[PDB]
């Protein structure tokens, strides 16, 4: 299996598209295996990371990293805790308009 | 770190040389120097996101061993302890994919 | 400084212009407090949670008064808050001091100006069949008193087209 993952990663490197999708489709898979103790803390600390202050240079990035990260986070089963203010901020600043509206 | 990559982006030779220099600084003589690594975070990140595969590999091999081989630890790291501001309009989530798939 | 290193694996918290209204000021203070960071030094352990000044700006300018949230004001008024928070505390001045009377008086003044503007705005059988409109038609050569049926008008149009063709 080690020969598959290395080449998969080297392939995701060159292509920004169809690699955003890999994160969107793999992060919830990781969330599924995380126990309640880990999931609680991770969801409680993700919002500070969704803000993460000066992590705004992606504001002009077409596939902004925050877009993919919040998409993956919302595509999980139990992700209840997320602030609506941060949701609106991400929707306005980043290209998360309709996703943010659907979540809200 | 500040000027060599700004004024000579096309001449990949001196860029690779500087990246090998910083990789050696990070790899060898660690017991002696550990404060210099604080300011050279942008250099390390740039060398990690460079377009050359060998440089990326030798940077990731040292970026991975610095953390425990546990999915939860790496997730917490990338979510609260790692600052992606120095990356610069980069799709850094592919480095998260690297870190999450290498521990498998 | 402690033996810190941004490259290390330190993973903490595994289990842990118009005047400013006091309302929007407390809103700004809370938005900064909701960034999960302390005002003692605005880069706490888990340094990835840097201060999002644009976020608190967006959260503040949604208050009563005008936007008034440029890159400068957001930092300036927080730096003004820090001294008076380290007198009454901002939370106390919000809960105290006629909690909702300030913004409500501001809005009442706005509505009074609205009504004044809307009020001062401006509000905004002599049958005469003069002979000029009939004389112009008489000069044109058509009788107005006798209504020509559409059939005769169509016949006249056909005759005119025939004359034109010849």
Draw up the topology in text.
The structure is cut from a larger assembly and holds two copies of chain A (104 residues) and one copy of chain C (166 residues).
Chain A: H1 2-14, H2 20-33, H3 36-51, H4 65-74, H5 84-93, H6 97-103
Helix pairs in contact in A: 2-4, 5-6
Chain C: H1 22-33, H2 53-60, H3 71-85, H4 90-95, H5 101-120, H6 132-140, H7 150-165
Helix pairs in contact in C: 1-2
Family (chain A): Belongs to the PI3/PI4-kinase family. TRA1 subfamily.
Protein name (chain A): Transformation/transcription domain-associated protein
Subcellular location (chain A): Nucleus
Number of helices of chain C: 7
**Beta-strand content bin of chain A:** under 5%
The percent range for helix content of chain A is 55-70%
Termini separation of chain A comes to 40 Å
Rg measurement of chain C, Å? 38 Å
Order of helices and strands of chain A: HHHHHH
What does the oligomeric state look like here?
part of a larger assembly
Radius of gyration computed on alpha carbons of chain A: 15 Å
PDB class: transcription
Keywords: Remodeler, Histone Acetyltransferase Complex, NuA4, TIP60, transcription
Entry title: The TRRAP module of human NuA4/TIP60 complex
Chains A, B: Isoform 2 of Transformation/transcription domain-associated protein
Structure, explained:
The structure is cut from a larger assembly and holds two copies of chain A (104 residues) and one copy of chain C (166 residues). By secondary structure, chain A is mainly α. Chain A is built from six helices and no strands. Chain C is mainly α. Chain C contains seven helices and no strands. The N and C termini of chain C lie far apart (108 Å). Classes of the chains: A mainly alpha (104), C mainly alpha (166). Chains in contact: A-B, A-C, B-C. The interface between A and B is medium-sized, with 34 and 25 residues. Chain A: It is found in: Nucleus. Chain A: This is Transformation/transcription domain-associated protein. Chain A: It comes from Homo sapiens (Human). Chain A: Belongs to the PI3/PI4-kinase family. TRA1 subfamily.
């Amino acid at each position: 299996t080690g020969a598959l993952l290395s080449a998969f990663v080297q392939l995701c490197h060159i292509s920004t598209t169809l690699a955003e999708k890999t994160w969107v489709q793999l992060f919830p898979r990781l969330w599924k295996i995380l126990s309640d103790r880990q999931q609680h803390a991770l969801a409680g600390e993700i919002s500070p990371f969704l803000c993460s202050g000066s992590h705004q240079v992606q504001r002009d990035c077409q596939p902004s990293a925050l877009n993919c990260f919040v998409e993956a986070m919302s595509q999980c089963v139990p992700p209840i805790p997320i602030r609506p203010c941060v949701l609106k901020y991400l929707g306005k600043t980043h290209n998360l308009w309709f996703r943010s509206t659907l979540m809200l | 770190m500040t000027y060599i990559e700004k004024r000579f982006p096309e001449d990949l030779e001196l860029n690779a040389q500087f990246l090998d220099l910083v990789n050696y600084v990070y790899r060898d003589e660690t017991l002696s120097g550990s404060e210099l690594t604080a300011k050279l975070e942008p250099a390390f990140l740039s060398g990690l996101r460079c377009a050359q595969p060998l440089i990326r590999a030798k940077f990731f091999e040292v970026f991975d061993n610095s953390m425990k081989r546990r999915v939860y630890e790496r997730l917490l790291y990338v979510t609260c302890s790692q600052n992606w501001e120095a990356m610069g309009n980069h799709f850094w989530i592919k480095q998260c994919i690297e870190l999450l798939l290498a521990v498998c | 400084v402690p033996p810190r290193s941004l490259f290390d694996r330190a993973t903490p918290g595994l289990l842990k212009n118009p005047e400013w209204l006091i309302s929007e000021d407390w809103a700004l203070l809370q938005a900064v407090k909701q960034l999960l960071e302390l005002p003692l030094n605005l880069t706490i352990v888990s340094p990835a949670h840097t201060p999002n000044w644009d976020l608190v700006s967006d959260v503040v300018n949604s208050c009563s008064r005008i936007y008034r949230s440029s890159k400068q004001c957001r930092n300036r008024y927080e730096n003004v808050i820090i001294p008076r928070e380290e007198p009454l505390r901002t939370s106390q001045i919000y809960a105290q001091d006629e909690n909702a009377t300030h913004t409500q008086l501001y809005t009442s003044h706005f509505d009074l100006m609205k009504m004044t503007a809307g009020k001062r705005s401006p509000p905004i059988n002599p049958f005469q069949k003069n002979p000029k409109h009939a004389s112009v038609l008489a000069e044109s050569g058509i009788n107005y008193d006798k209504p020509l049926p559409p059939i005769q008008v169509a016949s006249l149009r056909a005759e005119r087209i025939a004359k034109e063709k010849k």
